[PDB]
Amino acid sequence: MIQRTPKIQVYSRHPAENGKSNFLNCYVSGFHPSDIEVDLLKNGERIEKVEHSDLSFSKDWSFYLLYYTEFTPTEKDEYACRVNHVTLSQPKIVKWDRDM
Amino acid sequence: GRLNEPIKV
Amino acid sequence: GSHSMRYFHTSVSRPGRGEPRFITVGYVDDTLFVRFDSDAASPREEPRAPWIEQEGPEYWDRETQICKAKAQTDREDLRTLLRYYNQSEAGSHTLQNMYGCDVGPDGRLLRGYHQHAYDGKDYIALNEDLSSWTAADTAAQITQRKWEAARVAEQLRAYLEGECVEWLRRYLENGKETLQRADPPKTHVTHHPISDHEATLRCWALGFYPAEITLTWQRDGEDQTQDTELVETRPAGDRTFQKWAAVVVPSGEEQRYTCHVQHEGLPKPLTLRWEP
């Protein structure tokens, strides 16, 4: 049973401007099998009601999904994406960096 | 529009 | 220019947790237009783009029937594939299929596709001739023999050269506002000090459609492929895509580096440099 670990990117729909509403995205790609758990975090706690795309896959058969929620960035609030997958021994947390 | 053709492995 | 229509299908078994979940989505180019999920409360194929909404009830009824029937044949196929691979009933397994067509600017078929994967691995694919098969292993050769005997390829060829092309032509017309519009990238370069000795230059492409793009760095006119961090093209959620490419630049070398951007919405490729 082949396994492929996800690539993870956490980013905004538009360039971040403090105090302006935006969307926070976590794109997971390149993974197999398709079972995956993704949480978006605000100051370390799960954001409720996050939405996500329907499962699809790339030319090489690996899966991809987009998880997303509206958000309004500030100077002090920290955002992140937490991913679990069979290829990971513990959940992987990727912090949102508005410069990536 | 989709293929309507049952195909089993 | 050229265009594509593709249908993607995934079934994932879950022994002890009911029957396999079936998810299928349809795309024209990089635009999702339909979806079906067997775990929905009342599974039906649903629209995901405005230009498909005008299809009438007969279209949605037929599409929904096709999707439900495919969910069922996938469940049978998952059972068959346990036999072919001598596997137990206890584990979760995955069956994927993609099919569709590519056309050129004149609407003529460029090529068709119909291919399967089992547990993430190529299983059997229709060749570009639309007449013969590539089987990955001795299990897929059993399927190949069955599909040769039943003249499956001929049925697929008829669809891919006929209905597939004609649907895509219809969708491209009904969706001409969006499907036939390229949004060029919005581009800029940022600078991120690392230490006293070096900094990152990051070249950004935002807001572009379709997803295909090329984004490279040169130093003194030489491609920096091995030294460039290139992230996967990623969806913004507003139909458009994003990408960036970054290099680590020694202090004082910034003006020797140039970022090059190619996209179908650009009449000429762009060259950018860091502007302090």
UniProtKB/TrEMBL annotation, chain C:
Domain Ig-like: 185-271
GO cellular component, one term: MHC class I protein complex
Gene Ontology biological process terms from the UniProt entry: antigen processing and presentation of peptide antigen via MHC class I; immune response
Keywords (A to Z) from UniProt: Disulfide bond, Glycoprotein, Immunity, Membrane, MHC I, Signal, Transmembrane, Transmembrane helix
UniProt subcellular location: Cell membrane
Topology in membrane: Single-pass membrane protein
Subcellular location, principal: membrane
Entry similarity comment: Belongs to the MHC class I family.
Protein name, entry field: Lymphocyte antigen HLA-B27
Encoding gene per record: HLA-B
